[PDB]
Design an enzyme around this catalytic site. Structure first.
Site, mmCIF file in Angstrom:
data_model
loop_
_atom_site.group_PDB
_atom_site.id
_atom_site.type_symbol
_atom_site.label_atom_id
_atom_site.label_comp_id
_atom_site.label_asym_id
_atom_site.label_seq_id
_atom_site.Cartn_x
_atom_site.Cartn_y
_atom_site.Cartn_z
ATOM 1 N N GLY A 30 -0.048 13.947 -31.691
ATOM 2 C CA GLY A 30 -0.193 12.818 -30.768
ATOM 3 C C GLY A 30 0.385 11.574 -31.352
ATOM 4 O O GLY A 30 0.509 11.456 -32.561
ATOM 5 N N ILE A 36 0.345 7.509 -35.251
ATOM 6 C CA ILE A 36 0.254 8.951 -34.921
ATOM 7 C C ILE A 36 -1.080 9.572 -35.306
ATOM 8 O O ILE A 36 -1.858 9.015 -36.101
ATOM 9 C CB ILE A 36 1.426 9.744 -35.521
ATOM 10 C CG1 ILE A 36 1.268 9.874 -37.047
ATOM 11 C CG2 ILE A 36 2.757 9.093 -35.113
ATOM 12 C CD1 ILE A 36 2.239 10.870 -37.680
ATOM 13 N N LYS A 52 -5.579 9.679 -38.375
ATOM 14 C CA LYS A 52 -4.834 8.695 -37.665
ATOM 15 C C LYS A 52 -3.934 7.976 -38.714
ATOM 16 O O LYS A 52 -4.439 7.545 -39.735
ATOM 17 C CB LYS A 52 -5.811 7.708 -36.973
ATOM 18 C CG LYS A 52 -5.087 6.787 -36.010
ATOM 19 C CD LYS A 52 -6.022 6.162 -34.978
ATOM 20 C CE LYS A 52 -5.318 5.099 -34.091
ATOM 21 N NZ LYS A 52 -6.449 4.316 -33.482
ATOM 22 N N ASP A 142 -9.039 -1.312 -24.361
ATOM 23 C CA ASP A 142 -7.961 -0.358 -23.985
ATOM 24 C C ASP A 142 -8.535 0.908 -23.367
ATOM 25 O O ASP A 142 -8.143 2.037 -23.708
ATOM 26 C CB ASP A 142 -7.122 -0.021 -25.229
ATOM 27 C CG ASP A 142 -5.713 0.423 -24.886
ATOM 28 O OD1 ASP A 142 -5.230 0.225 -23.746
ATOM 29 O OD2 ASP A 142 -5.069 0.978 -25.815
#
Lengths: 292, 6
Positions: A30, A36, A52, A142
């Site tokens: 991802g 990423i 991450k 978000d």
């Protein structure tokens, strides 16, 4: 130079060491908000963890990288991805965290149609998380289907706090232009001081995702969609006959332009639509590994 | 997917 200065600051905040010493078989799965995401295997256990990786040199505002540490140190919860350890690895911040092997809500919304037992379960899970964050003054900023992750057995968790901020008696509102255009609250696009209400609007756009497969104006360039969100009446579902009056009543409490009139997360937990929520098992068939 | 705007 301010990069070196920043690596040094981050170093005093993160855990010492390098998780490559205990992790094997990094595989990219991802890319998101700020870098990423890989899975990696914990050598001694065979268990899988997510990593991450966030390049310091690639952030619009490097200082938001501290959000990964604030949120980890301080706001753990049933419906929030748990974060184990952070590290500085050369020019990157790495966060070792729970792997949500069921993947992201986006992959379900773009490939199948959820029913309202399923939508209610997602909404209930997300709202439980927001209720707890917002009571402590944390705004996620978000909220979108890409930020909601799932376990294989259908439990829903909020992820990707990199853009979050805090409000409090001394800083009652945020002002920063942050989020993903199609999901941004109108008062935020209009550059008004804003609070946790912005996450509530963004959830409403995520409900539109769940019903229609996409947020409104998704076919417009980002800048034009924000303008449309700022200026227009609240956005409508493509097809209102595809939601119950209960689901419609729920959405109408989310997509309110005046943030003072928008329902809070605390209020929304009591909404009759949530009475429809199925257990996590109900979400399971939707995931890629199970649908036909 | 559309990227976040910061």
């Amino acid at each position: 130079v301010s990069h070196e200065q920043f690596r040094a600051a981050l170093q005093l905040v993160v855990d010492p060491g390098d998780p490559r010493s205990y992790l094997d078989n990094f595989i990219k799965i991802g890319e998101g908000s700020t870098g990423i995401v890989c899975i990696a295997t914990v050598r001694s256990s065979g268990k899988l963890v997510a990593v991450k990786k966030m390049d310091l040199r690639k952030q619009q505002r490097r200082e938001l990288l501290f959000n990964e540490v604030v949120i980890m140190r301080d706001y753990q919860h049933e419906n929030v991805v748990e974060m184990y350890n952070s590290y500085l690895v050369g020019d990157e911040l790495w966060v070792v965290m729970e792997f949500l092997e069921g993947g992201a809500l986006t992959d379900i919304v773009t490939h199948t149609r959820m029913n309202e037992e399923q939508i209610a379960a997602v909404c209930l899970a997300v709202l439980q998380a927001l209720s707890v964050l917002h009571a402590q003054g944390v705004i996620h900023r978000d909220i979108k289907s890409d930020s909601i992750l799932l376990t294989h057995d259908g439990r829903v968790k909020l992820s990707d706090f990199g853009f979050c901020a805090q409000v409090s008696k001394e800083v009652p509102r945020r002002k920063s232009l942050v989020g993903t255009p199609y999901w941004m609250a109108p008062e935020l696009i209009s550059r008004l001081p804003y609070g946790p209400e912005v996450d509530i609007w963004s959830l409403g756009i995520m409900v539109i995702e769940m019903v229609d497969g996409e947020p409104p104006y998704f076919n417009e360039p980002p800048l034009k969609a924000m303008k449309m969100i700022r200026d227009n009446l609240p956005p409508r579902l493509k097809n209102l006959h595809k939601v119950s009056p209960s689901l419609k009543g729920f959405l109408d409490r989310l997509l309110v332009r005046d943030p003072a009139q928008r329902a809070t997360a605390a209020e929304l937990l009591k909404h009759p639509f949530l009475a429809k929520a199925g257990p996590p098992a109900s979400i399971v068939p939707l995931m890629r590994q199970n649908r036909t | 997917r559309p990227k976040p705007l910061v």
